């Protein structure tokens, strides 16, 4: 899923 | 999403310090000249990015560079985007000038031009086509030559990625197959390779699997098969595209039809289609035959192709147990190509299956017989030696161009003269990145078939059974050629034992040689090694010993013992070599087992995550093989349950899930067409 | 064809004494000075047996693994 | 003898795939890549016909111009 | 008797003045070295006698010499006797020293040794064997090498005497066949040649009649046949001697048997014996055949011999009209020797006689393809130019060594640098010696086939028909090879005319070349020339013109016209060339005439006496041919009537009768055994 | 005849 992908990247930033 | 991932990959590239400024570009140019004046350029050199810096105190220019694949050179746009990211994300000290020159080099082996895109500090770029044989020559770039640079980069990226022995340490492999629309990006690549099929003989070939490049045996055909293997939903599309090409370009029909057969090969659904196309391709062709006293250099080109298509037929018939029909095809194939290893190989297989061992051994007897890179890398050897070949000034300059890195952290990640830094940590797991991958290092090149040359010298010396090493060194290595012959011999001893094999050898002598005798003795020693039971009254054995023993057990078809030994070699430390062998077994099982599952999906998924993490540490973000394995796991588990099992892994986190979910999303996109 | 070339030997000779010169030493050790040969050699009729054999085997494969 | 050597061509090949290499370019222009020949050639039986013919003619001369 | 004659011959030798002292011996030695290092010595050089004189006023040494054959070198006795006569009969002036060195040189071509017998003024002699290749070498003489010098001198004397083109001007030819007992002397010579038969391939051969030396074609076999031809009463003796040799030396049986066949050839009495021996020689030999894959250099030696014996058989069968049997033999002969001219020649003859002209012409098409001497002689050219190349000092020295000669008589007999003096006048007739022989001079060497190069240039220019000359020059000369082919062509035009011959040539083309075309055109021109009627309304034509026309008429088989033209060429002046042709016609008539006598014995005897006289003038006292002709005349006339007719000749006298009665006595001695 | 030969030579001397 591309949603899961975006969620990981949004969380990588912390 | 994919753009986020790509930019992160672009920001996480390593750095090699040039000894003397510009040696990197001069060595490349000289390498290309040698390739051209040797007759076989092949794929040419891997792409490089060169960075030109000015130290200001000292008025020294100095350079950094690294190797990269997977940037699509459709035109200049994507390399320029890459260079723009590199420069906009730079972190340099006051002593380093802001005036930096960035250069991207992509070799075009269709025209033997090295295409170089220069990017300056004023954000201007220029493209230059260099002919290295005509030396002073620089050309103007047409759309036709942009397209063959494109095809060059894609072919080279696929071939390099699927062959670790061709990889230099620190190689950055980009996921060329991702884009805004996955299906469209994949179609564009497939159509590109298909349109260049008439020129596939100019794409080079692997000389270790075939004597001459053929329509079947060349890098373009290999790269197309490797890419289709991870896009199974696009097979029908590709066959349709190839049929369209025949309509418009019938003069090259043999190439398009050979690609069709190659694509459909080893796909159970499409066996009827493959056989049908094989039929309508082979029994004209049989007719360019006879009318011909002129003997022309295209006749050998087509006899080769006809022979290779018959081999595909022969292999099909053997796998379905149709031994009589296979022998009729194989006999015909051997006549058209007495120079073909594969024709004699399949003939021997026909005789073995028919239990005509003498005739098989005659066929084996009547059978025909590294890019100077890598000075810059020094192996850690499991933390036993220091791996640092930089001068103080070279380190000062390196640090000056990597200002955001604290300097002792930077020095710990230098392996010889290359800074193995991975900033964005895509694919990171603590277990792998902060431990085992720091030891060992990148596992690539000719030594990567096992870990003998990667561990401590003491661990090698602590192995008491010398034969374990002697039968696993890198020169002795079976080679693809004699590995195949070894397999035939093993197939024979499986039926009548080694002593039976010797009796056939004298039967053959009655109607003698040396290199085959070498294989016989090697085979014998491997068989003795294969029946070593390696414990209790409780000794201890290193992981390396279990690995080496596992490799030998694979070689002698002791599958249960092999998987068991390879798994125990991973219990100690993670073992990339053992891991890859296990993944390979799961992907393509041995045929002679009774439909046995040697490795359950939970075991495989555990190994696959570690392997993906390891590959990411040293910049393999392409990972065609692991995509293949993920696809197989998706097939038998479904994507939901698969992702559950991945989330269960104890080492899992955001950094590794970025990589995995990107892979899963790409795969999910493909299941729509 | 169907000749008969008597030797002196590399030089061969017909009954009507036409002299063809063949094989300086490529000629066998099973031929002598003043020995008679029987040249011809190159049968290009048996090229269609194996064309038939080839087409037949291809037909059997198509029948068994291709059609209904 | 009586063989049949299929060609790839100079290299010839038997049915059992034994490979004899003959005539780099001494082989005819009436032979092709993947053509079949029919070697043998060197009949050393017809050496006594002409020995008989020779002895017979010598006998006729002796009879007519030598004896009574 | 014979000793009186021999001493008179020894006292009548000419003198050549050496330009610079010793050039004669140094040129001889150098000639021999060239012969040896060229591979074929052949018979080597003719014998010489060298005379070393001292002028005393001037302290100059100077030399005189002359060429000689026919001295038997059994050992040193006979050459020494010759030298003793030379010195004891010298007539020298006061200025010439009495200390003279005399040297006799005889070359031995069996060992390549030049044997030199030196005779000093103290009447001592010494013999020296010189090897010219090993330069400084001088040897000791064994009886074995004395015997091969003997055989060398005899072979060379016979071959030289029967071939005028090999004769230098002024050559002294001694009658080697005379002795105290004629029969014994002849037997000794025959036995000598017979015992050397195994070595006949080392005696050289005539390359104009055969490509390689064979057991049949070599100088030893030729010399034996030529000598037996004037000793017909010794044939049975010789056959018996040869049979004895086979008993004692059976390993060389093929040589002895080949000699037997050669001797008996062309003798009607012994045709049954020849055929019988041919039979028992040919049908083993047929059997060294077959057993032989080794191919050895003796196999070509024997295939050649077998082929030559078949040719003898073929020629026998053709002459008896047995064309079918001849063709069977001739076909076999051509297979065993495709290199043999004679095998193809006889094959063509077989086809011609069978009126298969096309096949004959194919056989002709399929058919295989001077001792720097004589500076010292200048031709008189019929008294039109002066022939004197001596310096005043050279003449003074010559006169000083010939004191009994009055000096203007001496100068008139000098022809260039050789004094053609003949003191004892054996064979003298006024008509010949004091007139015609003074003009013309010796008729020998390659120019002796006609008189074009011997008469005045004006007489040549006065011939208006250029073709008469063009078809009679010395380079154009038919040669023995193409003379034979010419004969075949003539044999064909005799049956179907020249236009018929042309039609066969295109028939042959239908199943083209140049040298045979040359013969065709030559043949045509000769045929046109042959039908010239050369008189009345009374012109005048020189003797040379009649001669040349006669030679062409012989060539085209116009026998009646030829004899008529040749005879009229003698009416003017005596014509040695015309004479020899007429004598030859009488000795061996053309076969195609109806047993016609072209020349009666009275005409022949008249010519023969003049010819004998002419030959004697310039030192031919051997005259094998004229002996042959005398023997034939004796046969059909008886010796009494023959001698009557000789005494009737108007030019006859004591000097010519000494020669003739010596010849007749020798012949009479032979008719006893 | 050898007698004829001797007679010629005896006469040659005059």
Numbering used by the authors:
A (entry chain P), F (entry chain P): 2 to 15
B (entry chain B), E (entry chain B): 31 to 399, 413 to 554, 582 to 743
C (entry chain A), D (entry chain A): 4 to 12, 18 to 48, 50 to 77
Please, what does the article write about this entry?
One of the many transmembrane proteins that follow this route of transport in yeast is the chitin synthase enzyme Chs3. The transport of Chs3 to the cell surface requires the exomer complex, which acts as a cargo adaptor for Chs3 and other cargos. Exomer consists of the core protein Chs5, and four paralagous adaptor proteins called Chs5-Arf1-binding Proteins (ChAPs): Chs6, Bud7, Bch1, and Bch2. We also present a crystal structure of a portion of the Chs3 N-terminus bound to the exomer complex.
After screening many crystals, several were found that contained the peptide matching residues 10–27. This peptide formed an alpha-helical structure, and bound to a region on the surface of Chs6 roughly opposite where Chs5 binds. The Chs3 peptide makes direct contact with several residues on the surface of Chs6. Chs3 residue D19 appears to participate in a hydrogen bonding network with Chs6 residues D731 and R713. Chs3 residue E20 appears to hydrogen bond with the main chain carbonyl oxygen of Chs6 residue G31. Both of these Chs3 residues, D19 and E20, are part of the conserved DEESLL sequence that was previously found to be important for interaction with AP-1 and that we found to be important for endocytosis of Chs3. Interestingly, the conformation of this motif when bound to Chs6 is alpha-helical, in contrast to the conformation (D/E)XXXLL motifs adopt when bound to AP-1 and AP-2. In those interactions, the (D/E)XXXLL motif is in an extended conformation. Nevertheless, the structure reveals how this clathrin adaptor motif can be bound by exomer, perhaps providing a basis for competition between adaptors at the TGN.
